[PDB]
Structures are given as structure tokens and as C-alpha cells.
């Protein structure tokens, strides 16, 4: 599962 990265 991907790590969250905000935009």
C-alpha cells in the first residue's frame, strides 16, 4: 500500500 503524499 502506498505511503500518503500531500499535494
Amino acid at each position, epitope marked *: 500500500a502506498e*505511503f500518503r503524499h500531500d499535494s
Partner: antibody
Amino acid sequence: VTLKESGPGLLKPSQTLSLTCSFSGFSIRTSKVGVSWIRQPSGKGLEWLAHIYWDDDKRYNPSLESRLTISKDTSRDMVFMKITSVDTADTATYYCARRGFYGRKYEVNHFDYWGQGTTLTVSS
Amino acid sequence: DVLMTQTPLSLPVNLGEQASISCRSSQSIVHSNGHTYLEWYLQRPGQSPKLLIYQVSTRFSGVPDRFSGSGSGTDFTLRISRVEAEDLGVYYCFQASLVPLTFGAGTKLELKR
């Protein structure tokens, strides 16, 4: 920007580890940086444990996740870690690492600052 | 999980020589957002780890241009063009695309004799 970890130094097996990371030179609230805990067990390399985002969303390393609880206090500018049921293998240096970013480019983030760490030795 | 395999694990060098460390991920670490969260960290003896390179090839502020990162997908290389005494220590590659975030085992760049 400085990061300062605090922890008990020594614990007996089965106790709960409570760590604190305190930040200076900036505001967790304003910056919205994510924060991780990483450890370095005796004679090994680095291992990521847990991460907490500005909105209290959290991610853990499955290898230890069941024993870990990360939290934060924005009013105090601090991030915390609890590790339950400590044993010999938790003997390590515990690092606080800030996931800072370039400007307002939230997506261009990386561990830009690390604390000096706090060492724990677990023994009966 | 993403295994991060560094080669070699031990790298003796003479100061002034070039050095190269390979890092292979066990699967693509290209994130869906389009970035490849490949980072290099250096831990000098008796010191905290520090950021050298992020997004494969971008030097962090204050990191000198003798360091260069390259590669893509699963295949990554850190080069150091003329090794100085301050460069010695343990180098870790690191992926922050998939959970758990994983480090390589560490490559110990040391003074050769």
C-alpha cells in the same frame, strides 16, 4: 530547526516505552510537516517504525505495528511514540525525523532534519 | 514489502578517489503521484543520519556537487566524484513510496589501507 528526543534510557522487559520528540525553530501546526520515528537496533542499520501526518493520520511498519502507537500534540509542538511489551531486541537508538519539504511543495518531502536520538537499553 | 539491496555493503576507498554505491529495489518505487521517493542518507561515525539526495537525483541544501544520484524504477546509483574524509560513514538508500518505508542495509564507506 531542532529536534530533541526524550526517553527513559533503561527499561525492563514487558514495560511500555514512551518517547517524546520536541521541535524548535518552527511550528508543527503552521508547517503541516509529517513526522516519523526510525530506530537503529544494536549493530544494525535503520528501521522505519511509524509516521504521523498533520491531520493525525498515521502509518506503521507492519513488522512492529501491533506494538506501536504514534500521536501528536500541536499545542505543545511535540510528537510521541509508545511501544508496548519491550524486550531485549528493542535495545536501540530512537530517532525523531521531520518529513520537511521544499517551499509549499508538500509532495516534494523528505527527512530533512533528524534528532540526536535517544538510546534505550532493555534489561531485567 | 520492498527490499532495498545495496551493493557493496563495505566500500574501502582512498581519499580523492571516486566511489559508487548501487541500490536495487525489489519492485518499482515509482509512486502513483508520479514521483520516485528514493532518498540517500549518510550517517557519519558517531553522528545522526542526514539527508544527501531525494527524488533520486536532487541534492539537499548544503550537500556538495561531488555527490550525484541517478537511476530509475528499481535501479539507483550514488556516485561521489572525489571522496573527502567528511564523506566516510554509512550510506543508506531509502524508499518512501510504499509502506513499510524501507532502508537498505547500509554501505560502510571507509578509509582503505
